[PDB]
Amino acid sequence: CPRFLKVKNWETEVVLTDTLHLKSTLETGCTEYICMGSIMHPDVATKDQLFPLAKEFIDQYYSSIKRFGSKAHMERLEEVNKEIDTTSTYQLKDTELIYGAKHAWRNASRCVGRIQWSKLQVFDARDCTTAHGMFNYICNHVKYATNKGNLRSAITIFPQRTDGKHDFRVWNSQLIRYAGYKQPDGSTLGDPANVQFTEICIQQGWKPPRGRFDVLPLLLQANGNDPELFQIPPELVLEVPIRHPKFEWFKDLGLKWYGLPAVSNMLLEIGGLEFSACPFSGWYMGTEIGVRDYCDNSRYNILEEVAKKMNLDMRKTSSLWKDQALVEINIAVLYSFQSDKVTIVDHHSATESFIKHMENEYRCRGGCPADWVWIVPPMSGSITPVFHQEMLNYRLTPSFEYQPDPWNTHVWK
Amino acid sequence: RFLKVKNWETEVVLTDTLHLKSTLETGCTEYICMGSIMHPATKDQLFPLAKEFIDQYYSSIKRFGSKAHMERLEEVNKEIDTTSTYQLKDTELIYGAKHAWRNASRCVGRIQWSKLQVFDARDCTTAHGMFNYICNHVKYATNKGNLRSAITIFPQRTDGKHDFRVWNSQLIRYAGYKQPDGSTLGDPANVQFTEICIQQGWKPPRGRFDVLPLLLQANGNDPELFQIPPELVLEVPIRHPKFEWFKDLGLKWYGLPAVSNMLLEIGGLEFSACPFSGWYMGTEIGVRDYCDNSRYNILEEVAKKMNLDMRKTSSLWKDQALVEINIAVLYSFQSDKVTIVDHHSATESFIKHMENEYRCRGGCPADWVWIVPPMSGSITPVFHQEMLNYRLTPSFEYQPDPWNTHVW
Ligand code: HEM
Ligand code: HEM
Ligand SMILES: CNCCCc1cc(F)cc(CCc2cc(C)cc(N)n2)c1
Ligand SMILES: CNCCCc1cc(F)cc(CCc2cc(C)cc(N)n2)c1
Ligand SMILES: C[C@H](O)[C@H](O)[C@H]1CNc2nc(N)[nH]c(=O)c2N1
Ligand SMILES: C[C@H](O)[C@H](O)[C@H]1CNc2nc(N)[nH]c(=O)c2N1
Ligand SMILES: [Zn+2]
């Protein structure tokens, strides 16, 4: 592989040089003959697999703190090595855990919000042993991150995988989601994306309100045991009613959303150690809600209804009635969050910040892995600066990875 | 292996076998994806390439290994042998050109691929000849508003020193002028080319929408200037169906999108001059041409006239202005009965096309970065469609700009 790869920005002519790609640790899915750049998704580590992975990570940590080759570096290497030999695994120091989490984010090629990577509150929950304990840790996470609307990015890290039969998992794909209910007539109530998970909760004992915006309970698995249900205290769930600055009728749509985006189904990989339960949260970019959650056809799908109230000609697509309603819906989402003083960022500000971040990373780090297909917002793409920005995509470690859904793998006791 | 692609909105899963045919590179490796990078012979090289192309041509007409097939292979052999090149049969030329279009990963318009008028211009020898052939192309393809896809193919490359080149990047473009006060009149993308035309003898009217002259290079010679007769150049004044002040912006655009800077490769032969044209998708003009910061850059003005609050980005004033502009463009072309497709209709057609190709062909190479429109991405069906990208031949390839390689 070449040492220096160049990316160009076509709007500004700015050319950047990437050397960091050389540290790439896993597969993209692409080959020389085929590109899988738009493919969404393209029993434990042995002693011998673990050694080099740990050393790689420890070396990187001590390099970051300007102590590479130091006595403490060599000592930590030797202590880690001894531990893998005696126990087949090892434990990260708090400093290393914190470093690894921040770097997993920094390395997340699909995230446009990475300018904030070094400000991340890490909660060490590796002493957790039960589902009730997971509940307590998650509630504290939610409260801290929510911060009455002045959101703060955070991650809570539960115990690493051991033999694979004692995994900690948050079964919820996200900490806060709204229920979806399939009706006998084929229609769906609530969020159609969440029908399967909702059914699981119901089966596990949940009493469903059967509303349009019912916050789902937490379904929590500790130490490989069967998962348990807990209801997040409603006062910990900050919500924003959606209204529009011009259209007084917009509030009559009965829309709202939750303030806190918190992914809970991913796996955090640090130095070959696997943290299967590591819920992390930041704050929303407007389009996430205004374009995808609200306007995807398989989601709340409100374009028609909004178009109707806007008195739009909806007979020809070439009227762009869909596009027109989309913009207004996204204005309403930003207006409502700002008015309730809940942190949110529009797609213009976020993408501009990301370009600045990316340039800084090329400068200090020799590159910045980025997935253009995900970085470019789902509306108004080319009027954001990321559209014109060539990106290189590659996988650095530590990283957040996908993992199978726990109800597909769980061995019920 | 076989490969699956999922549409996440419909949950439809298609299976790609066609990719096993590719041999050219994508640019990516197992460790680095370059999917968002815009730009990532001899007798012994020539025959296997010729062979494969002839092989797939005869296979496409259900006469593989036929007598005609054999003789053709034999024929191509002797010719590469004796002349260091070979000439395509007419049928092969048309097949090759349609398939270059069909294989263009970046084109959302491929549902039309087999409806392509092919003009054989391989007997051309001079820039005057090229001009004549290009004027006929434009006249035919424009067709008084009812646009028709067409391609004009000039003589292939031989020694690299006698190249035919259309120096314009597209047949019809507006000039751009670098003002004293540092701003730009017209189209800033064309500033450099406009200046080469001026230097070569072109007398610029210095307006905002001056149709550039043709600059044509035949057989490696110096390029010569020609003015396309204006009655061949169909234009549309942009107005809005509700905002009667929109026409006052004084905007127009041309009806014929016609790429003229690409290289058509067929069976190892290189056609360095192959202007091809279709019809516009509205966003091309409404979003990119007009609203790119480095293009006509009109968002700010439109935003003013719409009396929008422009102090905070979060008012989405830019997005609002963008939608209205694209409405105007569509409305204008339609009102003038000039062929145009909106990005909703175009992306639908493309999904249907994809399904057709998977069914009859075993796949369809597609570049999501180019296919997804530059506005309202996820409300179009291609946003939710996983695509595989790979390079099939015959193909359209990029080539160097001629002013960087030509000796006068
Ligand atoms: C602080 C403000 C943040 C903003 C504005 C932000 C923005 C975004 C957006 C818009 C996406 C695409 C989401 C989607 O389309 O589903 C995304 C994805 C992602 N973000 Fe960030 N994010 C933030 C914080 C974080 C944090 C704190 C982490 C981890 C510690 C993180 C890691 C990721 C990862 C791994 C993805 C890919 C998710 C997936 O593949 O499903 N982000 N982010
Ligand atoms: C008939 C209606 C057509 C439509 C609606 C259409 C639409 C488009 C659009 C929107 C693009 C993106 C262009 C850009 O952003 O610069 C594109 C690219 C492209 N099209 Fe089509 N097209 C059509 C016809 C054709 C024809 C007739 C050919 C060839 C014979 C062709 C070959 C290509 C190629 C090679 C590209 C990639 C160009 C590049 O990489 O710069 N298209 N098309
Ligand atoms: C195929 N994707 C399916 C999941 C989409 C999703 C749903 C959700 F409720 C919440 C999210 C959160 C995404 C996110 C995560 C973070 C940390 C910040 C931010 N602004 N956005 C995603
Ligand atoms: C980075 N790209 C730079 C060139 C952009 C461009 C300029 C132009 F005048 C005309 C086009 C036409 C593209 C096209 C070509 C065809 C054949 C059909 C269609 N609807 N659109 C593109
Ligand atoms: C098929 C395609 O890869 C898929 O629809 C992707 C496109 N880009 C995306 N980008 C973001 N931010 N989020 C998504 O869910 C998707 N979905
Ligand atoms: C950096 C990126 O590759 C570049 O801006 C691409 C993105 N997608 C595009 N898509 C189309 N249709 N046309 C373009 O010019 C571009 N530009
Ligand atoms: Zn790739």
Side-chain angles (χ1 to χ4, degrees):
Chain A
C1 279
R3 199 125 157 262
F4 305 93
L5 296 174
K6 270 169 257 300
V7 304
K8 182 174 181 179
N9 185 298
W10 293 85
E11 172 188 359
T12 68
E13 312 271 63
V14 178
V15 172
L16 302 172
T17 311
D18 181 298
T19 53
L20 183 64
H21 67 267
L22 298 170
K23 287 264 157 58
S24 173
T25 92
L26 224 240
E27 315 308 284
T28 59
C30 297
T31 80
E32 222 180 13
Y33 279 18
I34 194 161
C35 176
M36 297 204 184
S38 61
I39 304 296
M40 199 169 324
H41 317 286
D43 220 29
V44 296
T46 63
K47 284 194 201 171
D48 289 276
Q49 284 162 354
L50 201 40
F51 289 125
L53 297 183
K55 176 173 172 293
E56 178 193 348
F57 166 78
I58 294 311
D59 282 353
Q60 186 194 123
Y61 175 70
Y62 277 89
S63 199
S64 82
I65 63 168
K66 311 308 175 194
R67 294 296 187 275
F68 185 90
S70 60
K71 182 183 179 218
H73 183 193
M74 304 301 92
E75 282 181 347
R76 175 69 179 136
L77 236 20
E78 190 54 31
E79 174 186 45
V80 160
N81 212 280
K82 271 201 182 194
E83 227 182 307
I84 295 177
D85 239 311
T86 51
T87 66
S88 306
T89 181
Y90 72 106
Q91 298 294 321
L92 294 171
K93 297 295 180 59
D94 299 347
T95 51
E96 296 168 349
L97 187 75
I98 293 151
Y99 171 88
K102 293 185 175 181
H103 280 74
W105 185 6
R106 180 185 199 178
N107 292 338
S109 61
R110 294 184 166 172
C111 177
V112 73
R114 284 177 283 162
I115 193 169
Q116 288 279 338
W117 75 269
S118 59
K119 277 165 278 280
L120 171 74
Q121 188 53 55
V122 176
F123 296 116
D124 188 356
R126 297 174 289 166
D127 69 349
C128 194
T129 68
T130 66
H132 285 278
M134 292 179 76
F135 177 64
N136 190 47
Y137 268 112
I138 293 173
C139 290
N140 295 347
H141 176 134
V142 172
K143 198 182 183 178
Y144 171 91
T146 296
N147 197 27
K148 302 174 178 295
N150 186 22
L151 317 189
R152 299 184 286 210
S153 68
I155 182 165
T156 294
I157 301 172
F158 289 108
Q160 68 212 44
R161 177 167 299 155
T162 51
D163 63 7
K165 302 170 195 181
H166 298 72
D167 289 355
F168 283 69
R169 289 299 290 281
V170 175
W171 284 37
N172 308 66
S173 52
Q174 291 80 26
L175 294 181
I176 309 187
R177 287 300 301 261
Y178 294 127
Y181 310 91
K182 249 303 207 315
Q183 299 310 101
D185 78 341
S187 63
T188 312
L189 185 38
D191 187 343
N194 297 321
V195 176
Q196 191 189 358
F197 180 73
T198 298
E199 289 170 2
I200 292 177
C201 286
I202 287 176
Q203 180 182 4
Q204 291 305 125
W206 192 50
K207 307 306 170 192
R210 307 219 162 239
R212 189 157 178 231
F213 303 102
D214 305 336
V215 176
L216 282 159
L218 291 170
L219 221 216
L220 305 181
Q221 169 174 350
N223 200 38
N225 294 309
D226 298 341
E228 301 172 20
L229 288 169
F230 307 94
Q231 178 200 30
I232 297 173
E235 66 267 33
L236 291 180
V237 181
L238 172 57
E239 287 178 311
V240 181
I242 313 308
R243 59 273 194 192
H244 190 293
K246 313 302 190 62
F247 302 140
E248 256 282 335
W249 51 259
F250 200 100
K251 61 132 171 304
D252 300 329
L253 295 173
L255 303 169
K256 62 177 170 168
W257 206 250
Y258 44 88
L260 187 77
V263 170
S264 54
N265 64 353
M266 286 179 94
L267 184 150
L268 163 61
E269 202 243 55
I270 299 161
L273 299 183
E274 300 188 288
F275 297 93
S276 48
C278 57
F280 59 85
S281 57
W283 54 81
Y284 261 119
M285 187 167 71
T287 55
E288 289 185 87
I289 309 173
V291 186
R292 310 297 318 280
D293 297 327
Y294 281 175
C295 293
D296 273 18
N297 299 124
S298 78
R299 300 293 305 286
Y300 284 86
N301 191 28
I302 69 170
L303 276 186
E304 178 149 354
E305 186 171 23
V306 173
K308 268 204 182 62
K309 309 221 77 182
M310 294 184 63
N311 300 313
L312 292 180
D313 182 71
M314 303 170 52
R315 284 173 298 172
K316 329 127 62 67
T317 68
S318 58
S319 72
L320 308 191
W321 64 266
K322 282 196 179 173
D323 313 64
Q324 229 164 8
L326 181 65
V327 180
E328 303 292 339
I329 286 166
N330 280 271
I331 294 175
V333 170
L334 291 162
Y335 176 67
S336 309
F337 273 68
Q338 286 164 0
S339 304
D340 284 3
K341 297 183 191 57
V342 174
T343 313
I344 196 168
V345 62
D346 65 76
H347 50 289
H348 299 296
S349 312
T351 55
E352 182 202 26
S353 292
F354 182 76
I355 288 288
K356 285 173 176 168
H357 171 60
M358 198 188 45
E359 297 182 327
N360 188 47
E361 292 283 85
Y362 269 84
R363 212 175 298 118
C364 75
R365 207 190 178 196
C368 179
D371 185 337
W372 192 100
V373 173
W374 271 61
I375 299 296
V376 183
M379 74 175 291
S380 305
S382 70
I383 64 172
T384 69
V386 290
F387 183 93
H388 309 270
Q389 179 65 54
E390 285 185 350
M391 298 167 196
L392 290 170
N393 196 18
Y394 49 92
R395 309 247 254 85
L396 296 177
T397 192
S399 58
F400 295 110
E401 303 295 344
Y402 294 119
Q403 56 182 337
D405 290 322
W407 57 85
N408 289 318
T409 52
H410 186 57
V411 179
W412 293 88
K413 298 198 173 328
Chain B
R1 53 179 292 203
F2 293 62
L3 298 174
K4 317 280 188 186
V5 288
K6 183 172 171 170
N7 181 296
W8 291 89
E9 175 198 356
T10 70
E11 310 217 43
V12 171
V13 176
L14 306 171
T15 309
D16 194 292
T17 48
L18 179 60
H19 69 267
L20 300 165
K21 256 56 183 298
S22 50
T23 40
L24 304 196
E25 291 182 346
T26 63
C28 312
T29 75
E30 292 77 320
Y31 291 88
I32 321 184
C33 176
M34 297 188 178
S36 65
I37 305 298
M38 193 172 301
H39 313 293
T42 72
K43 308 173 179 180
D44 322 281
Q45 295 167 341
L46 193 56
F47 187 78
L49 295 174
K51 185 199 185 311
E52 160 71 321
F53 167 76
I54 302 301
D55 281 340
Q56 74 170 59
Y57 167 73
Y58 277 95
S59 177
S60 60
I61 66 168
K62 296 165 174 180
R63 316 213 72 79
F64 186 90
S66 73
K67 188 174 182 295
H69 186 176
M70 292 180 194
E71 297 194 349
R72 188 54 181 149
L73 281 180
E74 214 306 285
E75 217 184 351
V76 173
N77 242 344
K78 292 198 165 83
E79 192 169 350
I80 296 177
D81 241 333
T82 34
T83 47
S84 314
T85 186
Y86 77 110
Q87 307 299 317
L88 296 167
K89 303 295 259 181
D90 281 4
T91 60
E92 300 166 350
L93 189 57
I94 298 147
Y95 170 80
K98 287 176 180 191
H99 281 251
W101 186 9
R102 196 191 188 177
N103 295 336
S105 300
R106 285 173 172 182
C107 174
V108 71
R110 284 176 283 164
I111 196 172
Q112 290 282 325
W113 79 268
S114 75
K115 283 189 194 179
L116 178 65
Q117 181 60 38
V118 176
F119 295 111
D120 190 350
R122 287 174 299 166
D123 59 356
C124 199
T125 72
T126 74
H128 278 80
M130 289 175 71
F131 173 69
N132 183 237
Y133 268 108
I134 289 168
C135 281
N136 292 342
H137 183 130
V138 174
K139 185 166 187 166
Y140 173 88
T142 301
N143 188 35
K144 304 175 182 302
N146 188 14
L147 309 183
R148 296 190 287 207
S149 302
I151 185 167
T152 293
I153 304 172
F154 291 112
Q156 71 215 39
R157 185 176 278 157
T158 46
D159 63 350
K161 308 162 191 277
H162 303 141
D163 277 15
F164 285 76
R165 289 299 298 266
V166 173
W167 280 37
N168 308 60
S169 55
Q170 294 76 16
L171 301 174
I172 303 184
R173 299 224 52 181
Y174 298 119
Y177 306 99
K178 189 92 260 296
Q179 294 303 84
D181 43 274
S183 67
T184 293
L185 176 59
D187 190 343
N190 298 323
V191 164
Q192 179 173 99
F193 186 78
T194 297
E195 292 181 343
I196 309 170
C197 292
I198 295 169
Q199 174 251 323
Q200 282 307 115
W202 189 58
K203 316 298 176 176
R206 281 158 183 285
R208 190 131 161 259
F209 303 98
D210 301 346
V211 177
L212 280 159
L214 289 173
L215 234 202
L216 304 175
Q217 165 179 335
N219 205 70
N221 303 309
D222 289 7
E224 316 176 15
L225 283 171
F226 310 90
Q227 172 201 10
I228 300 160
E231 71 270 8
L232 300 194
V233 181
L234 176 65
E235 295 184 321
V236 183
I238 315 311
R239 60 278 184 189
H240 199 278
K242 295 123 202 312
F243 294 133
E244 295 191 39
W245 51 256
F246 203 107
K247 58 178 178 178
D248 295 330
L249 298 181
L251 301 181
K252 52 158 61 171
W253 203 255
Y254 42 92
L256 189 63
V259 175
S260 51
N261 60 3
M262 284 188 88
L263 184 139
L264 164 58
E265 186 215 307
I266 297 177
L269 304 178
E270 301 181 306
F271 297 98
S272 52
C274 54
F276 60 85
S277 72
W279 54 78
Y280 265 120
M281 183 167 71
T283 54
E284 295 182 84
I285 301 161
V287 191
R288 307 297 316 283
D289 295 328
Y290 281 174
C291 296
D292 276 5
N293 285 332
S294 72
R295 293 297 299 288
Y296 270 81
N297 196 15
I298 73 168
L299 278 185
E300 209 169 321
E301 186 168 6
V302 177
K304 245 94 173 197
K305 287 285 202 161
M306 300 182 57
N307 290 314
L308 300 173
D309 199 322
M310 304 168 54
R311 283 176 276 93
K312 304 255 209 177
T313 50
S314 63
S315 75
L316 303 197
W317 62 269
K318 282 194 181 175
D319 310 68
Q320 287 196 278
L322 184 67
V323 172
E324 297 306 316
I325 296 171
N326 280 272
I327 286 175
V329 169
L330 290 171
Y331 173 72
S332 293
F333 274 58
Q334 290 172 356
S335 294
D336 282 3
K337 331 233 81 64
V338 175
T339 305
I340 196 170
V341 61
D342 67 76
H343 52 289
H344 303 295
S345 182
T347 55
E348 292 169 24
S349 79
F350 188 78
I351 288 299
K352 192 181 185 183
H353 172 72
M354 270 197 69
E355 290 170 357
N356 287 338
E357 294 295 77
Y358 274 78
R359 179 193 50 87
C360 76
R361 213 195 176 187
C364 172
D367 183 345
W368 191 101
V369 173
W370 277 62
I371 296 290
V372 173
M375 71 179 293
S376 304
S378 63
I379 70 171
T380 69
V382 294
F383 180 97
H384 306 270
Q385 180 69 53
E386 292 181 340
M387 299 162 193
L388 294 170
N389 193 25
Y390 48 96
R391 182 82 53 70
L392 302 176
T393 182
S395 54
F396 290 111
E397 310 287 354
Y398 297 117
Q399 57 186 328
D401 285 339
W403 54 80
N404 293 335
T405 333
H406 174 63
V407 279
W408 294 74

